[PDB]
Design a protein around this ligand. Sequence first.
Ligand SMILES: [Cl-]
Ligand SMILES: [Cl-]
Ligand SMILES: [Cl-]
Lengths: 286, 288
Amino acid sequence: PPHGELQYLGQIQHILRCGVRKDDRTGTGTLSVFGMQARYSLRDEFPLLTTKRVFWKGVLEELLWFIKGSTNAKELSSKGVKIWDANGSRDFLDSLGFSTREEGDLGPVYGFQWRHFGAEYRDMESDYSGQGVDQLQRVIDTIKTNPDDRRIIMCAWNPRDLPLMALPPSHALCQFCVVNSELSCQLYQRSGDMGLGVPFNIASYALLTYMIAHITGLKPGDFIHTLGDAHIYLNHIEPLKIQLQREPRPFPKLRILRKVEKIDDFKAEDFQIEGYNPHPTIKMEM
Amino acid sequence: PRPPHGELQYLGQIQHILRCGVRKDDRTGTGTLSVFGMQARYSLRDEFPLLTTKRVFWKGVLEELLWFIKGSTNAKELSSKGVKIWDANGSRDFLDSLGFSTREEGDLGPVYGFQWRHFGAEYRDMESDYSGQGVDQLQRVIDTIKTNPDDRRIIMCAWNPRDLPLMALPPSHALCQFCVVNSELSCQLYQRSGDMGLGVPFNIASYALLTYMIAHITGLKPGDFIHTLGDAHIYLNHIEPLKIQLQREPRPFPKLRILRKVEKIDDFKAEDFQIEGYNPHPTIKMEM
Ligand SMILES: [Cl-]
Ligand SMILES: [Cl-]
Ligand SMILES: [Cl-]
């Protein structure tokens, strides 16, 4: 078969070859293309990148943490996933003028946007039951009842909430589509750290589509990844040139071990990645 | 591995839906053929992507954008300019059918114009003084381009979930993202739902135009218009007219000319724009 991974590799090539140079956040530098899209097939496999070891336990735990509606970094850290701890640091929170917020409070990030869109954020402990739009449940509801719907959209980019977030979201919006009882997802990702971020991003949304499919009684179709600003940190070029030399191996398969009724009831234990045989880990730093 | 450029992209999308699309139903009975997820890149470099395989309604494109820019949500303000495309959705019947019986006819709700200029604001009606309210996204986009051209956050939103149930229609165009590269301004549109026969050609012209405008206001050269689709659909009653469109030879895109310097985006007038070398094949009729 033609490996969907090649699209990611192809994209990294194309940026190495045609990308333009810019000044990054803090010192490094970047190579950027604007506008990309790749189609990742979800039928009888899972797009977990094989040319390097992807941190799946990160993927799964963080997704469940979004679904939990959590905005507290420690709730995820308690699971052994540290990716958001930097962002909820005492220092880091102060550096964004969040002096009054408790360590770990990330503001209205994905968990909140997904489960309580439009609600007025207070803090990471507040009860937000019945508050804001529960986009994720409405997406699930609409999928079950109206599979032709052209408006099954979940938004995480909220202009009002931006000054309040500990991290501006990479992922502006998702759109779901049903075709002959297959569920497709398209993510508009406004900023893609191609070396570090994107592989994990692909798995994350691929895993979301598996989950929503599973509860609406459908089959995973395609994940379409669309990028706005797709960048490579100079820092990643060398480890990436080596990665481009690796040959992908068949995608693993994802197992859902019990029938789950609701999106809220999923647990880590319910997911087994089978046959994940990656090439050795690559540590991107920047 | 050369990509197709200009109009062939769109002709290739059409073929793709005709050959590979899947039959789906709609709220009328007509039906569509449908594909999910496409992208095309229309160079705006010394040319303007107004389709040639059929004459496009250029005047309408132009007037509709001017209409968005001044923050109008009254279909009659556009109407009085000789462009009717929003009239139906502002009619007494369409309004009653949406539960807005208290609305004067022509009142569309918080559609593009409101969203671009007064985002986050409380929509009251179409005659209301909104100035000073909501986020002027359009002016912020221009300002950010001028002050941090490298910004990765230059997004204009129109899909507001909270405003959706007050809108005549949910927007086809969810969001725009801008990008500055080397003194060239690019724009990517996420169009959640594309009517490929009737809407898409107009849609492309529309957002290429907005790109040309903002590029001008900020002293940049237009770069690319990247068109990204969610649901790309062809209504069954357009298959035949589109089959005819596919046999036609696309001729080179026209150039767009801006005839004076303009300082603010609000000052553009219809007279500031001129399409040149527009050599389209004849109008093809497609019914909504
Ligand atoms: Cl139209
Ligand atoms: Cl002429
Ligand atoms: Cl002719």
